[PDB]
Amino acid sequence: TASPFRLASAGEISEVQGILRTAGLLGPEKRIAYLGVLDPARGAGSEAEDRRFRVFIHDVSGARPQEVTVSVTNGTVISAVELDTAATGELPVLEEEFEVVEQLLATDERWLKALAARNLDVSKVRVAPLSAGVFEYAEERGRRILRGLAFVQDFPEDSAWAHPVDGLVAYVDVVSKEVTRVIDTGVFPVPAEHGNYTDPELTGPLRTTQKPISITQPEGPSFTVTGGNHIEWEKWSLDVGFDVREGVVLHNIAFRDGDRLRPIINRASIAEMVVPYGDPSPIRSWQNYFDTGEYLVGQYANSLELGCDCLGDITYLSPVISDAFGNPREIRNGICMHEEDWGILAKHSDLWSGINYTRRNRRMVISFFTTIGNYDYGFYWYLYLDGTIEFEAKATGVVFTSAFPEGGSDNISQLAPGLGAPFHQHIFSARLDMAIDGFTNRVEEEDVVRQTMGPGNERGNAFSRKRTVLTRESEAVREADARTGRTWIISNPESKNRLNEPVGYKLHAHNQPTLLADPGSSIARRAAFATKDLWVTRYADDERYPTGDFVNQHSGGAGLPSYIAQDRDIDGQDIVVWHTFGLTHFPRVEDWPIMPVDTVGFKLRPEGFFDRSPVLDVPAN
Amino acid sequence: TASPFRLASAGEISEVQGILRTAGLLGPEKRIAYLGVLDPARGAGSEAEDRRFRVFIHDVSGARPQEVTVSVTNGTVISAVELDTAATGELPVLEEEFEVVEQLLATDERWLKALAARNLDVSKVRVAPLSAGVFEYAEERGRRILRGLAFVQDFPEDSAWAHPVDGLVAYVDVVSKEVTRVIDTGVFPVPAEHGNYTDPELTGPLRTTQKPISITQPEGPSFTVTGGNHIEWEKWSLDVGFDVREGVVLHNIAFRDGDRLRPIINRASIAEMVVPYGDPSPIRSWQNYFDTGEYLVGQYANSLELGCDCLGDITYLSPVISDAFGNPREIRNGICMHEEDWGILAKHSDLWSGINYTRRNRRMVISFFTTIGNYDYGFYWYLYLDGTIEFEAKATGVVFTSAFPEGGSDNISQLAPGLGAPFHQHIFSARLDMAIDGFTNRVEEEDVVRQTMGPGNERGNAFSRKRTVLTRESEAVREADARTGRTWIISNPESKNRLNEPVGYKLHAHNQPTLLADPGSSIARRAAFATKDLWVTRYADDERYPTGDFVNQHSGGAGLPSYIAQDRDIDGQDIVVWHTFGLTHFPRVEDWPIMPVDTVGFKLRPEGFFDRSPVLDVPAN
Ligand SMILES: [NH3+]CCc1ccccc1
């Protein structure tokens, strides 16, 4: 029978559109802001498939938006409810709104006055469509607002990011098509130099010194793809999903240990990311973009070109999403899958036995790349031969710019003459619905323990470890402690290895700084997840995002801080780990005019999950 | 003219032997415990080469050892001094002593009594030749001692590590050939299971699922090697050295930025490593092995097999060292050099300009692998296209074992029935003699700064950075602070980029735990470097190792804590950064019977060193 974890197909999306149409929910004034398949319910699979899709529907004529779930299998509406967005949050930004901010401002007298003072041709002024957040403007409550920051393009192929127009910001109601405010705090020179990284004047002559590196697989890859998205590779099994909000998600990560298929992670995703800015200028002090929750990173996934984006023997998935009208849209070559050599796996040359042994490692890679305005991110999941699981985000694109003030700044870096880059962070939340050997799991926080020289430790060399079980959600909001080697172990207290110890996996964080904003800020309330490194909740099918379902213009407190208050039992239960991890970015000159990739991530390693090394059966190369 | 940074050649070593012989310093009772070329003096190179070699000479007849420097160019002894080892430390362990401990014990009545009580055939009992340290045994002061721990080999190809003989340790004087102590604290069962990772009974049938991954370079590599060890690759220039103590060392790391060859690091090496054990049992509580300083990791560098150890288009160096008699000995294929693809370098798809841009990264890799008893380590240096420099250590081999006590342990992990693995750390010191744009350098510690919501930061979003210059050595012993994003910037205060800011590089640590032992322990005094993450000293040619020159059986306080007390000026001077970084290892079942690689390291990234991205001239793939 068909797997309930298969990717949405074009025909399923069309059937959703048809169901909504027949139900009276998708007339010509409606736009789909989000649409995605839902995961099967726990315990389903008893020969009764029910593929459900969830949809957020916007109305361009001013009516209230709706959240709808349909059964594509049964042709039915499961639920449909109108949303009061002043309470629940606005819907995600629509792609069609990316152009609207500039269009509305181009005929506004106040905007034109600001541009004329600066001798800027309106036809050359791009306006970034920036999420608004919630600040002191009471008139915005319940309205769908974007804010606009201007960047000059000297010609149509020019990089506008080189030419920010500082001192100017505008706010627009994208439904009533009105400009609510135009704030001009003062003229700043528009930085003069271009940032055109394909112009020979700036690149100089291209180097001719790189000789080819050829990666091939003469017998093809060692993984198989069946059922469209089910991967089998080197003992691992999983399904690769794709959601317009989250991007690539991994389901049913399991490892075949002899004859048993042993679950490890039920669902892995990046359930939110946020980019908070640290410049106190009123032109930018409101800026915090939730690329996942506000913009939907899957929607903007790039088509990945062979030889350029993914090198070697690549197998692609081309996931389908909905356009704004409910028609299917394929993202051609949007997901790369391939295996890579990964150096030495294990090596020992033994003087006493005379045996010399070396084995090589490899990893399975599942990745996509997305672009939301100036920034571009690659999301990479890795599975290693030895049972390690890793995620890595690769941040690149063009840094968000400003003017560089006269006389310097404590909150902005200089990149070029007169050109600044405000300080900011990129903070991710990985939602790991755990299933270590099945669903009965618990988390322990493990710290190194230093011991005092004295009785029982007379030479002062001993050290130890302590593990603390997180028993209820009230105790499951944790912070890093790099100095004490803090990690978190997810174990199954009812499944023991051959040494009579509970099987587990250990989460190794990078221990980067968490959200720096003041705890009384709007962003600290709207991105509360980002203030702590590790959260553990009891699984609930509707607790999907650490920021809640409607992030755009939500006033704060949604998501994890609300979920956790239920104080549910997490000691040997079906649980979800939410790991916050991020990059703090004080931009450097080398990041301009296009940023070399920088990375952040985390990994999980088996910890007494196996009865011995799981890679003793790897052959000599 | 010949480069003074070239590798030692066989003929140079023979000439050292000849000079020592003619000078009366290398008769038949002498053994060379260490021999290596010295680096050129600052300001040399004025058409007056003087290749000097330093030698530590042991005497098997009981005479005092000597430290000698010769000029191989001039055929002269520069200096020769007898060492009082009770003050200065003993010489490094000799390879010929690896067999001596077992040999001496095999005829000792007390050792035979201990083995007979356990029904162990002496012919099957291997004895590890373990460094002694300095504890409470006054009779050891000034004597060359090794300690012995026993492991049974059931047959000559058996992995003895599976069969530790706990409760038993012996101490031997390897010069007088006497057994000073045999301590038998009680019988423990010798763990029964084997650990033979090539036995099909334990591996099971080898997997047949791995299909080949072929990495080739049809036009050869993009780097050149001239003068034996001078590398030019993708703007980088450096010389690859090899010392019997440190292993691979990198000299004169520089980057060609347009027409200027800009120095970055004058010398990079791993100047010490130490493995302290955290089991308070008297059988092991003395155990701390300084693989670099006591054993000499270069001496044990492996010959690296193509296709197995180094994959792709590999260029090898085969460095020469001295045997115990001063004859040259080549380590065939001991150093791998190759370039690797490294994913995406930079990527942006711009809605407004319509330009889609992707470039790939690559890295140059210079590596070696070494084996000292049970453990094997790979040392990898990486140079990236974008100016980043990285080091990574890969730890593998077989974990050091013990019995697993009845009734468990706070300081030992269980690996198999009755088989334990004592807790321990692997702690490295990278000595980075800096030369950021030349030798006039300084270090700043940079922390993130959180800001309070209030006047000038009304939305509570601002955050900043603070840099503190380390002005003198008295202020240059620093610890990590992961929570505040702490890094260290090495800059040249007299060399500014085009934006009028000092050029620099930023050191990014992993912020792993430092030495856990009590501060009053012997190991905390002998490995004081390991107690703090970052030290900065003023360059001095004789300050080579963070532990001093003679680590074996030195009583404490040598090296960095002594150097730093000079309180020299480091604010715009020729300085050396010593970064401590390590892995804390609570062994897991998966580490047995042979350990999958685990890693630790650090990286340095340019920080306003360049005037813009240094990779704009990279072509499309
Ligand atoms: N990344 C979401 C914010 C954004 C959207 C469009 C242009 C610039 C920035």
Ligand SMILES: [NH3+]CCc1ccccc1
């Ligand atoms: N690694 C240095 C210590 C050592 C030496 C020989 C056998 C086992 C351990």
Ligand SMILES: [Cu+2]
């Ligand atoms: Cu950034």
Ligand SMILES: [Cu+2]
């Ligand atoms: Cu270890």
Ligand code: NA
């Ligand atoms: Na779960």
Ligand code: NA
């Ligand atoms: Na220096």
